[PDB]
Design a protein around this ligand. Sequence first.
Ligand SMILES: C[C@H](CCC(=O)NCCS(=O)(=O)O)[C@@H]1CC[C@H]2[C@@H]3[C@H](O)C[C@H]4C[C@@H](O)CC[C@]4(C)[C@@H]3C[C@H](O)[C@@]21C
Ligand SMILES: C[C@H](CCC(=O)NCCS(=O)(=O)O)[C@@H]1CC[C@H]2[C@@H]3[C@H](O)C[C@H]4C[C@@H](O)CC[C@]4(C)[C@@H]3C[C@H](O)[C@@]21C
Lengths: 202, 202
Amino acid sequence: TPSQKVLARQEKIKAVALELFLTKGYQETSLSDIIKLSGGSYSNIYDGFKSKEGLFFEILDDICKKHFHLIYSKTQEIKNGTLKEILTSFGLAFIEIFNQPEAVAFGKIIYSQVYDKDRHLANWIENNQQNFSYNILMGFFKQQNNSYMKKNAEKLAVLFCTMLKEPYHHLNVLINAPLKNKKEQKEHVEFVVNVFLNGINS
Amino acid sequence: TPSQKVLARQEKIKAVALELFLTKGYQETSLSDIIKLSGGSYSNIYDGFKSKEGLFFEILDDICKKHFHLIYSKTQEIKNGTLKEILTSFGLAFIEIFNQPEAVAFGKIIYSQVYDKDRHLANWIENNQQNFSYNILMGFFKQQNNSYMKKNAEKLAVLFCTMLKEPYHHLNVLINAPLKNKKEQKEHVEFVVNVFLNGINS
Ligand SMILES: C[C@H](CCC(=O)NCCS(=O)(=O)O)[C@@H]1CC[C@H]2[C@@H]3[C@H](O)C[C@H]4C[C@@H](O)CC[C@]4(C)[C@@H]3C[C@H](O)[C@@]21C
Ligand SMILES: C[C@H](CCC(=O)NCCS(=O)(=O)O)[C@@H]1CC[C@H]2[C@@H]3[C@H](O)C[C@H]4C[C@@H](O)CC[C@]4(C)[C@@H]3C[C@H](O)[C@@]21C
């Protein structure tokens, strides 16, 4: 099928681009390095494949879509459940993803673009709110029979994720601080879930 | 006094450097731009004034020292106090500092150094743990008559600060998201302080 070939070719460009971002470095890689190694399976084409920043965000689309499915699947896998169980189940999956060398490597790429005068990153964040894992949590909060949880669902979602994820990821990205092993992951999830539900007057 | 003149000259270099970082840009400013405009009140000298990254961290030293005094002063100003009052008093001051155009501008500088092969930033973070506002909070926790608060004092300090500060600062830095006005600051502090002390089962 024509359509299959197109998509398969788009997958070749992204794969070349990722390998170059990892071996050669994001900053020293130019569009042309990517077109070159893509061969005559590119020659000046049409999508967000018009700059290396565009390719980079086409890759994140994929990864975000991959993490969302992963985290949704693990949550709905309960038949239950107490908010307690739902929060920790989400905890575990979310935290696990941020403790992969991959999450740090892309983190470094995002932070280096802080001076980008084309706002590719702002466009991307503004056009993908729907695709972040925060929405899954935001989804469970509304359903709970509660005035507060329903009214503040987006904020509690965002807060719980942040407590789980910062300042660790930040330090991972800037100074290469070590990741958590799985025991530390688990430990830190129960910690955060306790304070979130019951607070430090327990 | 010789010593006064030395210090006054060190203050001229930092001031030139900050003005160049703000007008010209951190990345396009080189050491030499700073030596030049410093005049023959520099000529190849000795401290952390041997690179522009060093000057930059000599400035942050000052700012961090300035914010610490500011936040300590506001906390001890109680004669009380319930953990509730102490947390919010700290909240207000901490959050107020992160909602200044200055906190964003330096944020952008730090994030752009993500690929620095000299680890100036890691050295600086590793050699200044004692100078962060987190310690003030960590200090009050130990004193509370409690097993948990005392055992986990550094972690609760770090958690409470993060809940206050992320993901807002991050979005401020990367995509230029808007700051909070004072009502939003206050609102968000009481919000965070409630969840921190009492959790979402209130
Ligand atoms: C957008 C994230 C924070 C935004 C957020 O949490 N939502 C707030 C939205 S709003 O207030 O309601 O407007 C920030 C920017 C985009 C995210 C990055 C990208 O989403 C890419 C992800 C890929 C992940 O699987 C690994 C972390 C990561 C490499 C990033 C970590 C962190 O979640 C980021 C860097
Ligand atoms: C170091 C901060 C986070 C580290 C932290 O909170 N402590 C954890 C230490 S550890 O787990 O116990 O090892 C990160 C890096 C250094 C901090 C930056 C610098 O401290 C400079 C400050 C200046 C502030 O007044 C404005 C924000 C800011 C421009 C920064 C915001 C944020 O607090 C930063 C960027």
